[PDB]
């Protein structure tokens, strides 16, 4: 395993992106964004990295505030997403520089690109899709997704994979409906897997732990969603 | 880039690839002072590699600055204007981008982080001062006919370095009303400053191409710049001894 940082600036702010590559598997590969949730990268977003390294993939772990940081609670970084959230223009122009950092590295097949997302990570993964960048595919756990744009109808090259929480609060029913709604009219090759009485960030263990409510770990549809991810993946990098 | 090692320095910022090109002598052993060298407002081009190129043969690692990205390089101002002004209106993201390639200067293992310096032509001589206006640890700046930006009181005794502004006395970039500001608040904070004004000489005076623009306020001058770059070494010289 083969693990190494790789820096940028935006606006003048250092990013310290973490690239995983197996040397167990040769020659050039398909490459993965992989986008953590809203505290930051941190060790969950690492090791889902370096896994999808292992299973024959070049996997890119984003750092999204920066200086590698990762934040303790909510509150720290709702300025920043709200930020986002409300120029979505200016974050699928970060998002799209991501994905070119990605396929520009030599061992990543830059024809052959995917995107995963945790929590606000899948919201980022759908807003690039929605961008019209050439990925094969996108998945994103427990991910509040951003509500339907006209303007970006047909857009999306990318297979979806949304695996969520039936109970979720941040993905509400309406709100998803209206999200599968936008990408049934593309004839958008579109998954749910939902998992009864499951919450938001089910892939992580620490959210058994978090102050806030809607949180909970749950290692079964973890699997499960890993699973349903691999084999998306399968598909179009066969 | 006749007997100097010349190697590409790649950075991404805001989405491009800038491609830096850093000049060492490799007849020299060590560490070295570094200098930066940021280009006119046209792009990184021929006139500043070859500013980086003779300060590798003087003993310095130079690494010009890829100030568009791409390496590219404009004809038409024009063009280059909104992304101008745009730091113009944003001088701490400004400086915050310059203390970056300051930082990528003094990381190499050939330069010696604690004695650099920055050199910078047209707006590039405003890079140089906004570094050094950001409090950085350079020994030296030198602006060739630069228009530099108004003085800010945040900034008020944050210069390290020593300062040497060469200017045309008629360029119309540099009037001497907001150059006076200039020299006032170096004044006020005791730094360490020079001004070589030539009579007779306008803008873009280092860069032969200058007379081709078919512009009044751009012409090269041979003499005014054969005396600033003479100017330059000498201060070097002092700081690096
Ligand atoms: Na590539
Ligand atoms: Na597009
Ligand atoms: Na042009
Ligand atoms: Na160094
Ligand atoms: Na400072």
Redesign the interface.
């Known amino acids: 395993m083969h693990q190494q940082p790789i820096?940028?600036?935006?606006?003048?702010?250092?990013h310290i992106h973490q690239f995983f590559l197996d040397e167990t598997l040769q020659g050039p590969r398909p490459g993965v964004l992989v986008f953590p949730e809203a505290f930051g990268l941190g060790d969950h977003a690492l090791q889902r990295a370096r896994r999808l390294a292992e299973l024959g993939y070049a996997a890119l772990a984003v750092d999204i505030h920066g200086e590698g940081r990762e934040f303790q609670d909510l509150a720290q970084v709702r300025p920043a997403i709200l930020a986002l959230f409300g120029d979505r223009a200016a974050w699928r122009?970060?998002l799209?520089?991501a994905h070119?950092?990605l396929r520009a590295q030599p061992q990543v097949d830059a024809a052959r690109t995917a995107a995963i997302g945790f929590c606000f990570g899948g919201a980022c993964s759908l807003e690039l899709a929605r961008s019209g960048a050439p990925l094969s595919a996108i998945v994103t756990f427990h991910a509040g997704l951003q509500p339907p744009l006209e303007a970006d109808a047909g857009k999306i090259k990318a297979k979806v994979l949304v695996c969520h929480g039936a109970e979720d609060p941040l993905m509400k029913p309406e709100p998803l409906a209206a999200i599968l709604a936008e990408l049934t009219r593309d004839k958008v090759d579109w998954q749910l897997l939902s998992h009864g009485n499951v919450v938001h960030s089910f892939t992580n263990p620490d959210a058994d732990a978090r102050g806030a409510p809607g949180f909970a770990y749950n290692a079964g549809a973890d699997r499960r969603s890993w699973a349903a991810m691999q084999g998306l993946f399968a598909e179009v990098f066969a």
Not at 7 to 14: H, K, L, P, S, Y
């Open positions: 820096e940028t600036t935006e606006n003048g702010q250092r122009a970060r799209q520089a070119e950092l």
